[PDB]
């Protein structure tokens, strides 16, 4: 261990997820439930639009709705910032831009609430297309692998990071969504400010049928890598 944080993800730990959107007014809110293994890199979530009809693709909110639960290999453990800053936690924020769309803002806390992982959000969209791939929900239902390179922010204590995550649309063209993100420890205990490296993710989405709310099922790894040994 090389931050108390860390003895926190010695196993298996639960998650609950919050969201209150609101996009071009159209107010919605997501609960989901699952749990995280930072031992091994693998989240598996299931996700409920608790107020009817998400108004948004399904795809669009993965990004939003724990990094804390990356892999982060043995010779990368100093370079954990997201256990490092628990069980107080980290407000993760991000700017994504939809290009030619309109963007979401998004504000979260990530810390532990008695034994469960909670990360809670509220997020705002605004400038979206009536007829555009976002509201017009022309986005397929999958979600691509990624690198998201990690830099630390000594300024704020944290750190931040910027990528592109391309959204597959129906009619066969790409929906970037450009995301700024933050991340601020909550506490003013010490964290690991990390050398710059990047976390490899993998998601699939799928649907549990018996479910008849409006839902999704992810099941994600997410591995750091890029430290050449330290």
Same mark, same amino acid.
């Given at each position: 261990?090389?931050?108390?944080?860390?003895?926190?993800?010695?196993?298996?730990?639960?998650?609950?997820?919050?969201?209150?959107?609101?996009?071009?007014?159209?107010?919605?809110?997501?609960?989901?439930?699952?749990?995280?293994?930072?031992?091994?890199?693998?989240?598996?979530?299931?996700?409920?639009?608790?107020?009817?009809?998400?108004?948004?693709?399904?795809?669009?909110?993965?990004?939003?709705?724990?990094?804390?639960?990356?892999?982060?290999?043995?010779?990368?453990?100093?370079?954990?910032? +997201?256990?490092?800053?628990?069980?107080?936690?980290?407000?993760?924020?991000?700017? /994504?831009? %939809? *290009?030619? =769309? #309109?963007?979401?803002?998004?504000?979260?806390?990530?810390? +532990?609430?008695?034994?469960?992982?909670?990360?809670?959000?509220?997020?705002?969209? /605004?400038? %979206? *297309?009536? =007829? #555009?791939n976002i509201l017009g929900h022309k986005l397929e239902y999958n979600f691509n692998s990624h690198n998201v390179y990690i830099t630390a922010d000594k300024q704020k204590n944290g750190i931040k990071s910027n990528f592109k995550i391309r959204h597959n649309v129906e009619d066969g063209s790409v929906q970037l969504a450009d995301h700024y993100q933050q991340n601020t420890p909550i506490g003013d205990g010490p964290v690991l400010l990390p050398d710059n490296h990047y976390l490899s993710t993998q998601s699939k989405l799928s649907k549990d049928p018996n479910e008849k709310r409006d839902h999704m099922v992810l099941l994600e790894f997410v591995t750091a890598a890029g430290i050449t040994h330290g």
């Open positions: 261990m090389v931050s108390k944080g860390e003895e926190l993800f010695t196993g298996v730990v639960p998650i609950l997820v919050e969201l209150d959107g609101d996009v071009n007014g159209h107010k919605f809110s997501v609960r989901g439930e699952g749990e995280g293994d930072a031992t091994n890199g693998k989240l598996t979530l299931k996700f409920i639009c608790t107020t009817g009809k998400l108004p948004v693709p399904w795809p669009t909110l993965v990004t939003t709705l724990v990094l804390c639960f990356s892999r982060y290999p043995d010779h990368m453990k100093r370079h954990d910032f +997201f256990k490092s800053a628990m069980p107080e936690g980290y407000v993760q924020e991000r700017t /994504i831009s %939809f *290009k030619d =769309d #309109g963007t979401y803002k998004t504000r979260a806390e990530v810390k +532990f609430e008695g034994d469960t992982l909670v990360n809670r959000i509220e997020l705002k969209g /605004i400038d %979206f *297309k009536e =007829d #555009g």
